[PDB]
Amino acid sequence: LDPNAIITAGALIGGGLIMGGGAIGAGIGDGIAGNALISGIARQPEAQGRLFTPFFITVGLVEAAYFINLAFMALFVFATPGLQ
């Protein structure tokens, strides 16, 4: 039972959890923001121009987190902290 094997399995599981959480959060948050945008445009077709400015912000604040998660997942699998 090589220590590196256990550490790598744990790192893979941790990265899986990180990406699962990131994907759930990103998908649902983007869906909710898009729901807001779609309803706003449906009510006021010409408001779309001014609805992208907040929408994008929201998307940022969502995707940022997701992408942050991504970075750390790459840290777990490749530069596995604590691996000997």
Partner: protein, 46 residues
């Protein structure tokens, strides 16, 4: 009151909902028509 439809012309938002507003407004319309008729009658009487 009967309804006659005109072919065609951002939609409106109604609080709380269109049904209650319509129910509360239609009697006001009847009163408005009665008042307009009364004013017309006064002018024609003069």
């Amino acid at each position: 009151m009967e309804v006659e439809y005109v072919g065609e012309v951002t939609l409106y938002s109604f609080e709380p909902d269109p049904e209650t507003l319509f129910d509360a407004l239609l009697p006001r319309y009847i009163a408005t028509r009665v008042y307009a008729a009364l004013l017309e009658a006064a002018a024609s009487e003069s």
